[PDB]
């Protein structure tokens, strides 16, 4: 099968996520065939640096034959059994046991899904059921943020703050509210980041008092907003959000679907930013994307609420899927026992953050260079001196991302934010290779900017 | 690693779908370890007949080493790449091509998910986006049925008609409405099933006219209601539903998550019942449950509408997952090339339906014996003569289901409906084994009914 034949069949038969089908079919899809470590090969034999780890999820890198062996052996013994008929199976029990050891104290119970989107729907039903068991049936509104991403179910798209998702499906659904994101570069006016952190967090208080605290169930946030452009909030933000939630008896929910399983150098983003959520959602790096699996980690107080309520009429055919559970077990055992998470905290994370700032800080149309552990970003700007963004935010990002893609480097644009989230196993040498290619692409970018 | 230790760790750490955690933890979870053909083994070494094919999904049976090999090979070459960055990969392209050959003509385009629940959410967003592209932004209400099941996302639970799901989450969401289900035994009054089929279908028209047709986007149904108790509608129902949809310019959606990939002896339930939906949802049997994967099959009309609209701001990280796609490809290739679906239509389906009626018709507390292909059911009743159901629908079903489970037979109760959906590869001899155990369980059931007044 040629590149041509794969493109024609893709065009004729496959509808892609978050894509304009007509424009993709006219352009021709890029066909990825093989992965190894931090590298991909396409159908034309291009070797590509995957600076996005599939979709911020291939945390141990490509080529784990041990994961394929764990999948094969589980699929041969018991490919599926359901967790609905008062039934369980070894793989889901062993994974649940291992996950309780790497999650913080008070996170003993896990509910399994197929995806981050399903984890978020589960978390919404759980937080509403929790407040019904407490005898507060009005306490149902969840608060999220503009430019937050919580997946693509009806519930997750509603809780997310992407207007472009709201406009497709009549979203958000009721009992959903949104506050502004803690994007210092745009909203931080004449304030330091730390001052801005407190102002941005107090938008949650303003929103709670406008709705009424007795109607507010939860505040939900990514510790770092991922799909929104790696928006790293100031150090003062999360402690103030937490204070506000505790003051108004609002559950605090971390969406750990990106940050989870080592991306920040801690096991979870909320540990890096110093807040204690009541629940958190995970997927992606839970299996390093080798198989679909998600989870909701339920803290003791919410777990006791759900259990005291009797039947929880929620769950998926493939909840606790044995093969997915065996793969997630191999992945979490590798992250811990091979020191991959520890390595992000004390070796590759500090190296990446230093080298990312050394590489990009000098460019005249780059600003707000930021990141932690192995997630990093910057913003393309029209005038750095005035902190002026390009108009039609996203047009210049597209141009830069296409230069990267043409030069066999995967880094993505969210608007005019450029983001990177490579495999956590990336070597220092591979960080320097990636940065040399990105640096040359940015010199091409600046020259092309001036040329128009 | 003992039964004991697995039960303690499950109790301490695992929250199960659709379960009362406190009551499960006190009872102890039954630990399933091994599967082969139609059989399971538990941690105590019980050999069990799986009359439910996992959860109506393990259509080719347990023990396909070829599927494990396809998974292993794909996971070694390219375990994951996303379909978001103007990117694709061979496994999803090959699966999409094979799926177009086994779907009806005019279903060329497939959107991939991880689950039937995500397929249903995708279908809701697609139906609403379609009507926006047509310039009809109020055409947004989807109609389902009481006792319909459309999964467990907020969207799917809303569209489904399980009040026990609606009461947890403040559901349904807006633009969801429900009509009564075509359950002849309960609602069919003085009528033949065929007459009742027309009346039950016309409840859709009455509901469309009550809401206003310009506000109605779609009618969605399972060809056979699965989780609701294998409610098999009369032959007249689906053609009338389709007429009503066409009359009022309402999209017709089949939820094929159970019926799909051969359960009825056709590839899809809507083919057996003789209706042409505009879209249908699939999962379960798509991979025979060997890996999580769902899909929405989009007909030409809706595909043209979605494509004319430009960006579809919808999809999942694991949409088109390569390993799941390679396994789904092996499963659909086996269903077609090994004659498994054809064998349901021609051989095992007719045998099961005949033997199911022969076995269960004689019992004084069994009525409405029904089924098609390899899905079958009956209803436990208080008084057969008067067609009276037990009060507290579900209590007598629980008793019967527990007798089955205690006798190493998995058949489920939905309320007082007993349901069976075994692997499609079940032999005639395995059908007779399953029915002999179920028949003895029903004699025990009747005796303990009478004993306990
Ligand atoms: C990717 C993502 C999700 C959704 O996960 P799927 O597995 O794509 O359904 C949810 N929340 C966040 C923060 C994510 O980054
Ligand atoms: C099982 C089922 C679903 C939901 O599928 P998951 O894969 O459990 O999310 C949806 N619709 C019908 C008819 C089903 O039977």
């Amino acid at each position: 099968r040629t590149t041509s034949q794969w493109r024609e069949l893709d065009a004729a038969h496959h509808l892609h996520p978050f894509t304009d089908t007509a424009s993709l079919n006219q352009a021709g899809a890029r066909v990825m065939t093989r992965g190894e470590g931090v590298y991909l090969w396409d159908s034309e034999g291009n070797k590509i640096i995957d600076g996005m780890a599939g979709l911020c999820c291939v945390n141990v890198g490509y080529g784990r034959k041990d994961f394929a062996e764990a999948a094969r052996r589980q699929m041969e013994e018991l490919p599926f059994y359901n967790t609905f008929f008062k039934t369980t199976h070894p793989a889901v029990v062993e994974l649940s046991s291992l996950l309780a050891e790497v999650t913080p104290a008070g996170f003993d119970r896990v509910f399994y899904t197929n995806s981050g989107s399903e984890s978020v729907d589960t978390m919404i039903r759980m937080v509403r059921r929790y407040w019904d068991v407490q005898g507060k049936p009005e306490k149902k509104t969840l608060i999220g943020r503009w430019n937050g991403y919580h997946g693509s179910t009806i519930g997750g798209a509603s809780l997310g703050g992407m207007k472009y998702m709201h406009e497709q499906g009549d979203l958000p659904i009721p009992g959903m509210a949104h506050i502004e994101q803690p994007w210092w570069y745009k909203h931080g006016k004449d304030m330091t980041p730390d001052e801005f952190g407190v102002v941005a967090a107090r938008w949650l208080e303003e929103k709670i008092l406008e709705i009424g605290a007795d109607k507010v169930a939860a505040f939900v946030g990514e510790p770092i907003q991922g799909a929104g452009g790696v928006i790293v909030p100031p150090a003062t933000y999360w402690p103030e959000i937490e204070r506000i939630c505790r003051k108004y008896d609002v559950l605090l929910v971390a969406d750990e679907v990106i940050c989870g399983f080592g991306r920040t150098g801690e096991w979870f983003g909320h540990q890096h930013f110093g807040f204690q959520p009541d629940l958190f959602t995970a997927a992606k790096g839970l299996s390093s994307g080798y198989l679909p699996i998600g989870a909701v980690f339920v803290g003791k107080r919410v777990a006791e609420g759900l259990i005291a309520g009797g039947d929880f009429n929620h769950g998926f055919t493939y909840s606790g899927h044995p093969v997915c559970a065996a793969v997630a077990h191999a992945n979490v055992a590798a992250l811990r026992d091979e020191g991959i998470v520890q390595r992000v905290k004390d070796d590759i994370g500090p190296y990446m953050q230093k080298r990312w700032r050394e590489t990009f800080s000098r460019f005249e149309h780059v600003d707000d260079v930021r990141g932690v552990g192995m997630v990093q970003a910057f913003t393309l700007v029209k005038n750095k001196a005035k902190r002026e963004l390009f108009p039609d935010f996203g047009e210049i990002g597209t141009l830069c991302r296409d230069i990267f893609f043409r030069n066999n480097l995967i880094m993505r644009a969210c608007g005019d934010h450029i983001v990177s989230a490579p495999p956590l196993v990336m070597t220092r040498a591979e960080v320097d290779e990636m940065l040399a290619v990105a640096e040359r692409c940015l010199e091409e970018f600046e020259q092309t900017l001036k040329a128009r």
Side-chain angles (χ1 to χ4, degrees), chain A:
Chain A
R1 220 145 227 177
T2 73
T3 293
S4 214
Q5 294 163 338
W6 272 324
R7 270 170 191 173
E8 158 167 36
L9 286 170
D10 194 85
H13 298 306
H14 177 208
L15 291 175
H16 288 239
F18 286 89
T19 93
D20 175 348
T21 299
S23 154
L24 178 61
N25 293 355
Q26 291 163 344
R30 192 171 203 178
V31 187
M32 302 296 185
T33 65
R34 152 164 136 264
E36 148 114 313
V38 302
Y39 302 112
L40 293 161
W41 283 267
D42 70 12
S43 62
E44 311 263 61
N46 296 294
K47 188 181 192 182
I48 301 153
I49 300 169
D50 190 1
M52 293 297 302
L55 196 65
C56 312
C57 57
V58 187
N59 285 4
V60 301
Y62 299 107
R64 280 273 177 146
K65 316 212 143 138
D66 62 317
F67 289 11
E69 173 56 22
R72 186 201 59 83
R73 156 210 174 301
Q74 179 65 56
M75 189 172 299
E76 285 192 20
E77 342 199 315
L78 181 75
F80 178 66
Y81 199 73
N82 76 74
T83 54
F84 291 58
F85 296 172
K86 305 187 161 178
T87 49
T88 199
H89 59 70
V92 64
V93 171
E94 305 283 0
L95 174 63
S96 304
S97 164
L98 172 56
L99 283 181
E101 300 183 27
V102 301
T103 57
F107 293 94
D108 298 303
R109 291 209 160 98
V110 60
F111 190 103
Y112 292 104
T113 72
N114 303 304
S115 66
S117 299
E118 286 180 357
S119 294
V120 172
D121 277 27
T122 303
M123 175 274 299
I124 300 165
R125 293 196 68 204
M126 281 180 165
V127 311
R128 291 186 170 167
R129 178 62 178 156
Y130 172 83
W131 287 117
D132 277 338
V133 174
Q134 303 314 301
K136 298 168 178 198
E138 316 79 18
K139 213 159 155 68
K140 296 300 174 51
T141 294
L142 291 84
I143 301 171
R145 299 179 289 183
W146 297 120
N147 206 36
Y149 189 69
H150 292 112
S152 183
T153 47
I154 297 316
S158 298
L159 183 54
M162 303 305 183
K163 303 206 154 271
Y164 61 82
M165 291 175 84
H166 295 174
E167 294 167 0
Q168 304 194 348
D170 292 34
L171 307 183
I173 64 177
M176 294 287 173
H178 296 85
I179 66 181
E180 186 58 87
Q181 57 165 352
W183 183 23
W184 173 77
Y185 196 76
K186 170 77 167 164
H187 300 302
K189 309 195 237 273
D190 290 334
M191 298 173 241
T192 66
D194 282 349
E195 291 169 323
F196 171 71
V198 179
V199 171
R202 281 180 192 183
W203 302 326
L204 177 57
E205 177 162 27
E206 286 171 19
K207 183 59 68 183
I208 290 166
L209 290 172
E210 174 211 334
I211 298 168
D214 303 309
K215 300 196 92 124
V216 181
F219 174 74
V220 186
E222 303 161 271
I224 296 167
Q225 289 160 263
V230 177
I231 317 298
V232 182
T236 53
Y237 175 81
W238 276 112
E240 187 68 357
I241 287 295
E242 181 172 48
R243 185 199 61 87
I244 288 159
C245 285
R246 296 316 170 203
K247 173 177 178 72
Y248 294 108
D249 191 33
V250 172
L251 295 177
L252 176 48
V253 182
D255 192 342
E256 291 284 356
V257 172
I258 290 201
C259 287
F261 296 96
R263 174 72 45 195
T264 71
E266 297 292 338
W267 281 85
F268 300 93
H270 64 85
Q271 297 168 303
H272 175 74
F273 292 98
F275 74 91
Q276 288 168 123
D278 295 305
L279 314 79
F280 64 93
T281 49
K284 287 198 181 103
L286 177 50
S287 58
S288 286
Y290 273 65
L291 282 178
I293 178 156
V296 183
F297 290 97
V298 190
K300 267 179 68 111
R301 166 174 311 272
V302 174
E304 290 181 27
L306 294 180
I307 296 173
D311 294 332
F312 186 45
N313 298 319
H314 183 77
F316 308 100
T317 302
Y318 300 139
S319 284
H321 191 284
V323 185
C324 302
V327 164
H329 185 288
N331 179 69
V332 172
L335 284 169
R336 179 177 63 196
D337 299 348
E338 295 161 21
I340 298 178
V341 182
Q342 191 63 43
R343 178 174 171 279
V344 175
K345 180 135 125 167
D346 53 35
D347 175 5
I348 194 61
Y351 190 78
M352 171 65 91
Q353 290 322 306
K354 187 180 206 183
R355 297 282 301 116
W356 186 266
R357 291 154 176 75
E358 286 179 349
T359 305
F360 291 117
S361 294
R362 66 190 194 75
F363 287 98
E364 171 178 20
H365 292 104
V366 170
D367 210 354
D368 196 17
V369 178
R370 59 192 179 267
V372 358
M374 287 291 277
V375 67
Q376 45 286 323
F378 55 80
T379 307
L380 301 168
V381 300
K382 193 187 225 316
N383 191 318
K384 202 179 179 160
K386 300 146 110 294
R387 308 205 345 244
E388 173 191 12
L389 301 172
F390 291 92
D392 339 303
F393 204 64
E395 286 274 31
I396 297 314
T398 299
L399 173 64
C400 193
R401 164 202 81 201
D402 290 354
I403 294 172
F404 291 150
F405 205 71
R406 202 176 354 261
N407 284 278
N408 293 332
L409 170 56
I410 306 167
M411 293 196 171
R412 154 167 165 251
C414 319
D416 291 343
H417 308 295
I418 300 300
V419 306
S420 181
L424 305 184
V425 296
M426 189 172 260
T427 65
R428 288 188 176 205
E430 290 165 350
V431 164
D432 290 328
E433 181 188 37
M434 192 180 66
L435 288 172
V437 170
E439 183 201 345
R440 274 197 329 266
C441 291
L442 239 68
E443 295 182 351
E444 197 195 307
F445 170 80
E446 234 92 350
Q447 194 165 180
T448 305
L449 184 161
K450 281 152 39 44
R452 297 150 210 191

